[model samples]
Target: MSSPASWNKEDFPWSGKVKDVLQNVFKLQKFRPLQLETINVTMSGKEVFLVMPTGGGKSLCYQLPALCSDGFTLVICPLISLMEDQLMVLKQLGISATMLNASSPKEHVKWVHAEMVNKNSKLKLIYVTPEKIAKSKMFMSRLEKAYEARRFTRIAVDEVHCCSQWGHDFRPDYKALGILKRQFPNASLIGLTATATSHVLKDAQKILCVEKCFTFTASFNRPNLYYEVRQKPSNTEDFIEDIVKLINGRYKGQSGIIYCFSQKDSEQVTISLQKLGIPAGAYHANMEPEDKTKVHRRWAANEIQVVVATVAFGMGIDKPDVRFVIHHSMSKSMENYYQESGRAGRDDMKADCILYYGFGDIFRISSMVVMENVGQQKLYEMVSYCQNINKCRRVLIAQHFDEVWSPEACNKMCDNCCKEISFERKNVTAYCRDLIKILKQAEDLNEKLTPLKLIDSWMGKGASKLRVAGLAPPTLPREDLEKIIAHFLIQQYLKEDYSFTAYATISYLKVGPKANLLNNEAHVITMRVKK
Candidate 1:
């Protein structure tokens, strides 16, 4: 195995032929720098994990390989529409390809299977959902037979980040894809995703067992995306009106997506927009299959000016001219937010990516967490990004992915970069010292408390939980206690623990390392307090 930079046409004659294949089969005169390297790595029979932005020619990485190779290349994609879209492009290019999913007709699926079994069949690529491949034991057995017969050359796992538990869109079905390595050990494995944080990427690499794989990370920066975070208004009607005005002002005649957190919100926003004579459509998981299809088709055909939808609406959508993407509320994770906003400006045109931030959304999302600590960790990053007005938004986001971003690179496209927003500084030496003392006191008393109970106890509020636990009340003002607890939690002076109740998971508070260390004089907060 050789590095991507060292390998060339002579190393693999098939790779040499790729230039011609790109020109003849895909009808493209050139390959993007990353695309060429990705193709080179996979063609050399080395595993690959590719991280490129949306509309970054990822399909060509596998599509070109399938065309240039001898046997069929299996693509395990997540979405039916994605399969259809890619299949259409392949067919138009005169490449033999097919896909099997629930949406496909029974006859078509059977025919595809037959084509796979037929040795002379010209099928060069086959796309199927992980559910169809992993859940169907009979299908896997049959595919394994063909696979063992040297009928498959490569296995491409699209959206491979979904396989990671730390990934924003973790799916159990994606986990089952790991069996592919054993099923087809001879074939090359390729994992591709447009949005994966460093944590998610590391988890994905381990899950795929591709530790020795050639990883290609393209720049995460999308210079065309103009980022903005607006303070959300409390009134629902006023919020809708303000969003409407924003849409009218910046994108009256353009296509856009407004992502809500729930189905009801989508319907309400779509209805409100419709009442205002704005061409809006609603899409959510709760809609009937036919209705969802209609909405997807209409939106794809540019019949709808705006699609008010939940997170369910935007995966695999290939609208290159989307002028804007506005989040009706804060997204659950920074990765989710980045992926959603990335749907805008795919064509490399200047586009707006705005998020409406309100603290209420934090509590709402926190209540839905099954994995409490992980959820809160993600929420912490999301909140930090939203609350950040003193730094370059682009640099902050880039750093979240463990990528280096120079603040000087931001060209005033983001609100924080274009305008000045002043933030007040607070001296927290006494606050930190006091907060650490409280945690030590809690430990001394052997009284476990949740943040709610701790806050109540510290503020001298006689909450039932605290009372029942024989907790003593406050030494700090209510507002000061609230601020101190927030600071401690945010700074990891206090860590959250969770326990399962009958119907819900509850968060509890525990003293974190920094606080424990500070109490022992082992560490400090790194920032000096103003005297």
Candidate 2:
């Protein structure tokens, strides 16, 4: 019932025994300031939520604490590979750790139970997935009984952010985590995540519902890494050529990840990069788990130079030596960007994070946003946030989680804060206000018609969708109305991704000398930089 404490060096015993555990057993040279504090909190029998960056030694926050804590500690992890990675590390330290998932054999499960009951030497840690736990009510009941007998001490939830609906990896089984508290109310609880936003953090805390808990947050900015954004032409092949050259220039044999927005693009990029003589691989949701693990293992062994993947690629992946991470498009949000970019330069080495921005790419992403089955206003807000160039990227991202960073510290660590002056600003206030008015009028005509179809109807086009929705406008477009509707699509004012919605009113309505609007918005014909 004591209040949880913040991690600090003064709290660690730092005796010769603990030092030996660091150097001789774990092979760690020393602890970072945050790591020392995490160990203090968790080992001190306090519940905790840890939000650290990729390669920021997040696993140690629980692993070491569990090692130093009393009794056997159960670590509920998401990925089998992640469990294996941590288990391997513990085995190297002569600690007894095991994991049970769909891949493990029945004999292994029996062996694990025997170790726990007999108090065997090789039973310090056990890793299981939520799905595995859900199917084994009797196993869980037995574990609870063991805890009641003082045989089990604590429960560790790895990648706890997955429980949140807003997180990228929203696992339904994660909801079962609350059952742990019901079964083992007296046992200490710990939550660890490498890529949690403030939203995910709040949801995770509620999911665990730990009454007394410690919290640790590390800054998300990657100051050691050089961040850059390049403008590109719309051809897919051309974009591949330029991006491959950039990757080859900085990384030839080193490990890196190229993130594509779609599965087909991920495969195409992988093949193209491999043909260029780089040892490249690909991963997506379509791939079998075995194939995915093979690719991951190859990369881990330094056999692959690059892995082209979609957004599903890197959560719970503990590759610290990754030298580069490149995004093929501007990500949906800064929270997603920072976590993905934070993967690079984890070994305290210099790395590069680059984004390739182009009209077609933007158009493709925006179109999808417009086609989504959601509200137009909400989509616009999401797009506007992406288009914001006035604020520090770090602070803008922090605001999502209700956190703030000092502007002085933000520096140029973010895409905007670094290249603030290079962007050409266009005040499109009047244009946005006018566009919304037209949309509202169109909405009145047919409640079921989409924004794209309404725009189609206004252009005097008897489109199938508009006719089906009964959205034929009574008044044919006047000259001004025609101009406004055309302006919406050509200028990227409207995005058609998830539904009919307006994205940021990014200027440039026309390409020629005659292309200019009589509104408050201005478009950039050219840019010194793509911030």
Candidate 3:
């Protein structure tokens, strides 16, 4: 039975059977990297957590396994668009798949319920949203019936991050999905997502009861999308003018999305764009379902060139030809930014991911979600990414997501990498040693070492009680010190410890895991000083 089906013979698509379906059903010749391993693990009854990026061939990872298994795969999707979008494509591919959603009529749902209980059903996959899994007893009863018959082979959880509070897009219904493992302990489970931090991934594992699941993560770099930042114009007219120029110049007559922070912002931007003779539409949470559908229909059919939407309103967009994604303001965190901006260029072609950033927008975002110390820390990191003018954008993104990448890989795809700048390596071995020493001493004295205070201590200034600031060269600019500190944080030579109060998250500096830079002459810290 383990033989499944095989191209070697009639096709358990044996080892090569998986490959046969790839060519026969999906028309693909080979599995993308990490795809075959993830599928085989799920097929063997162990679960998996996949953190592949958007357009990274994640759907095929689970979908192919479903075709190989004797029983159908149960997919828990978070959005209507995700469910319907995939369902439509699977239908086109001649795969035996079915779905149920809130919009399904009582009769249609009843039919789907019957399909779930039939062991001999031709269906290989069933897609439904978390809300149904959370609220529908009828759906659960049929699912239980399938499990009783021993035909419930696998469960696929897309956007699994929704199950964890640490996720940028958290939903209570998604949390209720924890019952999957509890109810069907025998079935294999696979949790797939586009972006999640280690913290969120761990929490999602616990939440979904897949703590022992194997994880497969691909590189986070999106080379097809160019990353650029512009100073947010202060005046409303200038801001709109910038938008017009960007749309009319480089991305003219192309499909794009402008993500604004609020509903009113979305409306204003859409109205202003329409008045300026650009065909634009507004989408937000407040719009009626029918109206939103109209806008979507028009946008997809090319009746409208652009859609200005609030951040959450734009989730799960699968348009392939979207030429650009413009952030009207800085996002709260890198995860949010990465997930949202990734909507563009899904066709594996060049597009733009631009952000209009300002320090003033930081207060609005920080004050908005002042709940978690971790959240505030993330906001600070996002600010640092925007404020840094020298680092490659891809390098910064890869570092935030805990991936290793070099600036040369960016290949002038980012604003920083495009600049014609030369570099001179500067070693800060002594300075790094003193910074860690000051942090330890401050902790011993029952005080906190903030970055500014650390710099002052190095400069022998009174801002820090320790006047070790004398170790610095007088000609070194203060901004360079900030750059050095930020680099150390990125390199894990120093860390920030955040404590929470009712109103704020207070951060202090500390020695990190890789503080070997301060250990010996052989261990040194070096950075490029632009020449």
Candidate 4:
């Protein structure tokens, strides 16, 4: 693998220039307040951590550094779509940038690798995933060589919170990022994340040991968003009805996001909305790459009025005029909800950002997290956050990240502020009193009944006490079981399994069961099942 020689001498616009690049083609009279500080910090060659809000021009922090620095800067980004998107924008501006990820062809990936190895290659910026970083020893060795030889400028860690233990979206691959500092001790390191509470901010700092850390927080207030949560009707027709009203009347021809907790929900909502004659499509991890690209394009181009998606959709989506963002179910944390709902009204025009909030949003999400898919603690934490309505939603969200901000319901745009809403929360102690009774019943029963069955018992559906007989003769009657079980799960009177027999048996009735059905952890499913 070799790079073309003396590409620098080949009469290029950049011409080994920094002031020309910034002033002429880029045409910027002055740097944004945050960007100027971030650039200066990186130049000092210290490990720096940056937490700036979305739409805060995070790209410029690294982009400017990469352009001015001695060698190419490597950016570690998690999403293939994000990489492609960044590359497309850079190419459009005639900036030389490329990406390396699973989606890249083997031939192309190899060519990119060769370019990096051939020290004189004009590659200014490269984007790749942490997964690739861990697996590719050869790449790491090359990076080391580049650093020593002055061909590698610096390493910019995007979404640095993902590297932190406390980040809501923390990934194991991110923890491996400390290895970057280890490999290139003298290399300048800068970390960036959009949203971080005090906790997550500290975690990022601790993990990165960033000596020069600057945290920039935009007010966690989206004033244009009118937050509202309605109790879900069992018929589901009501859900569809609310969506149509938003699309046809208030949000017509405007792009928006519809986040469903599961793949089945994504598809069903997308199809249902499309049937209503709205241009809408859906995306999930299961969708083909081409299909995902097409859906994203359609949504971006406004050929689609709405894009129904699992939580997979919104990491780095940069569309500015999306007029609304709807969550069909609750998110595991207010931060996640705040982030997604934050998507709306970014154009800063008044927008309808609603969650159709209901109790089922809690159970549905909890059941997902409790399944031991990741761990039990995450599930519990998510449920506790959802059930506590008295706390300032903003404070709870910020606290989750270990970041502290003064609590205020100042954003008059959220539902609570709009109507002076004061919630009379359910006495959880009373609910726990009831829960103890049910757990006692479960312990006394000889057969280990499912969580649904226990919930049925609480709802007064005289289901047989776990039959010595395997079937136990349909407790509370088969016809009434649905309502009984639904109430228990939704009301936080009970919790369900990850993929219990009930779900496995009934899944075919709906769409195919999701590989990760628990999108918002356990709260989402619990929410759907609630009264």
Candidate 5:
């Protein structure tokens, strides 16, 4: 590895060129706290992977070095649209940058080659889509020539999670990026993504050939975003009405994105919103490229108030003032959900992220999963998270990425935290008092049972062997019985006793310390579960 740019400790190590780029080139007074360290790490020839939230100034980490360094920096992006956006931004700053993609005209490609390979051009930044590098043999040879001339000093991979099979947006084109590390043995490498779990993180490092110590994970918490999940109502019209009322009232005249699962749904939602006199548009993969581009332009210019789009939309959207992101349907995975919802509040203003979930939606998505077992498992976790109305929304999201979070950090930003702290506990205490009595009786009777079997004993169902053994059973409806059991587990009044049996790992119930405090009137408890 090459040495980092050296500077004295008395002042910030940014050279006069870096200072000029920051002060005049970008027209910014100083770097944001996180951007400074990230830029230093990338300029030092360290193979760092950055996990940052959307709108976190990830572009500057590499762009600044490209301007300050002597040689060219190659940025590999996942989408052609994103590459174009970066290219335009760099050009506006009077920087020597250009992008090569299928959409580029032949003359433009020739100009790019001429600037980088043939002449004493001052090109410092070159952006290209992963597909161009993976499939274009001619482009590959051109890149090889550039490498032979020692023109490529560093390589940056944006949305690096797509390189991992475990990632939400897995792509074979991204997987072929390993060639960059092999071909340019001495060039620095950096990967950037808005979201990554442990599986994706491990796999991305292996694929990019980066060491683990160089990975830099920023805090996942976004304090400016308020999150809420609404249970889907049986009456679809009523739900639409409520959503319209929400937009017209609190979020009135603000920009937002309404994400749907299908193109038909996107069109219908857009039409529905337009009928209510809101400026709404629809976008999806099924639309013509021209139509999609028109919608994107309208939305970006704030000419459209709301955009109802399928999952294919919003990957490269750069609207910083979007005040809300409403999911008309549940997203497929936590990674997808986080990235989509994160599109809102990029300007660090308070924004709302609402998700509408129904069992029917889960059933529809489950039927389309290619890996039935793995897909179902992830879906189950996502569904359970949506249904958990009483838990801290931010904490649940953070844990999905293997980060520890606290409700106090939420500070009443979420729907649950905005209400009374013990809202769920207050409603469940009466049921819990009775449920604890049943568990105490079972304990005395030496009856071991799972929550399902315990519910059976309460419901007088024959599925429970404990009920057949002549133990006193509480008479209650299955729904009520399940509710009581769920409350206990959520409150930690009871725990799943996981002890192995001959047949399988039998899940039984055991009394927790919270169960002992049921009779104490002054005792108050709050529960947080880590999966």
Candidate 6:
């Protein structure tokens, strides 16, 4: 079986050695829910795909399996920092591991090169980036040589979502990774990531050629982390003041991260913290790679209490004592938010995740790109997440990732559940149908209606040509219609059609998939609304 089915431990002969190595070598006592099962399956020579929450011990799923076998493991990291962090820890644990990259010391590269030719080398795990795989024939030849000798073994692709073309964070280099399975048919392959939707997961498996792969996932809930969103302070001084209060009051002397959307904001946030007598630094992709490493090292060493960085930073971070992660502005997507905020509470201790965002920030971004349409819809989902008040934050996030979670599982860990909020169920399927009707008739009407015009048409109050029926109930508020539209956009019943030019961006809505559901009478769609 790919996943657990109440199977007894004695089913596997290596079950005893797994526990013994985990406790004796890794110096760990107990395993989390699916760790042992994942390890057992991976060691059994079956292909695997695992999506565990950050700090849920994902590394162990691949690491221990590598250690239990004689052959070496090939670990692929998207970032050098991540590989370096993993290599450092593996060495500390007394596991022989090395990485080859542009930043790697020359002597170490020479050693890794010499060791790769051996039929069975002392290095248990070798880390490299996808770019290294795509760009270097020398590295590939060595990997091939070892594979031919039956000395090369397991493959671990960290941040596996990057391999999916349908994924939000798709990269071209990842598409080349499909060659791994085609080239090395005997080696077991495991793709690991912290966040992946069902579609992305399926696409990743298909691309990686893991047709007979086992899928393992941990619960998305992080009970030890508290989530809350604060209105962005209207002014910069007050904004800095509010964050200062947080650091001085609840988060004093604790390590934390403040994320900014832009490089300028990252530098400014760090400078403001330093001016306030707090130890802090800034990190952005535009910086010299060495400088980013320096800032990361300083934060890791506790020389700085906080590091203000762009949202792109931190997948490679290895710190376990970080007490908080704050977003200076809204994340562009839920997956990005989940991954960034997940950097906290690695030790399973209480930590905080606070988001500071505003409508202005959202509109500015929506007005900016005009992507392939899915990109446009993803922004709306984040807007809904930020605007939500009546639902548990964790529940909304879990639903986004297509996982099941209850508000009771929140245990007052989110701001919405910590306080009281009244909610009632409302059905808007008819109004949805009305909007679909308008979009269906949008052959003319000034060439596809704007959102407000569609809302107006559905509400029976807009331009005479667009406003045909107004089938919505009179008791429904106008603002609620906008919320309904937001819901429709998120559900893919409606889509933002963006036609961009060299100048400005223009966006309008059209009927999308599942709009058919609203058009039918059999499917009654109900949503929780504030009472």
Give the root-mean-square deviation of each candidate in angstroms: 6.5, 8.0, 8.8, 9.8, 9.0, 7.1
lDDT at 322, model 5: 86
Per-residue lDDT, model 5, residue 134, is: 86
| Model 5 lowest lDDT segment of ten | 1-10
**For each candidate, what is the lDDT?**
0.75, 0.63, 0.77, 0.62, 0.73, 0.77
Give per-residue CA lDDT, model 6, range 1-531, as digits (tens). Answer: 144644225358778888778998899988876787778777888887777876667899889878887768889887777776676568668998888786677788778877877765788888898877888887888889888778788899888988886665577888788888888988889888776466778788888888678887776677898999887765788998889898889988899989888777888889899999889987664555557567777987878999886876444444678899999988877877887898888788999999986645654456654554655567777888877888888888877666523344788899998877688888877767777778877645556777767766776766667655545444466656666777777677877676666886767788887777754678987767767
Q: Cα miss at 235, model 1 (Å)? A: 0.9
In model 2, where do residues sit more than 4 Å from their true spots? Answer: 1-6, 10-16, 79-85, 88-95, 102-105, 131-135, 162-176, 182-186, 194-209, 250-254, 283-303, 313-317, 362-392, 404-531
* Model 5 lDDT tens row, 332-370: 877678878888887788999999876456545654553
Could you give me the TM-score of model 1 versus the true structure?
0.72
Best by TM-score: 6
lDDT of 2 by residue, 65-108 (tens): 55665567888888776676676567657887888887678798
Better of 2 and 5 by lDDT: 5
Clash counts for all predictions: 0, 19, 13, 31, 0, 1
lDDT of 1 by residue, 371-439 (tens): 556777788788778767677788777776665222448799899899855665654555566545555
Error of 3 at 403 (Å): 4.3
For model 4, residues 306-362, the per-residue Cα lDDT tens digits are 877587544545466878888887675555666777777766788776666554444
Cα lDDT of model 3 by residue, 1-531, tens digit = 012122123223356778778999998766655777677778778878888776577899889989988878999987776665676568768998988888889898988777777878888899998878889888888889988887787999988888887775688898888788977999899989876577778898898888887877765667888998887875777898888888899987899999988787888899888888789987765454457567777998888899886886324345778899999988878878887788888777999999987544655566565666676678778877876668888888877666422244888898888878876788877767878777777777787776667777766775555654345533467766766776777677987666676976666678988996455668878876667
Task: Estimate the TM-score of every prediction.
Answer: 0.72, 0.72, 0.67, 0.72, 0.71, 0.73
Please give the RMSD of candidate 4 to the true structure: 9.8
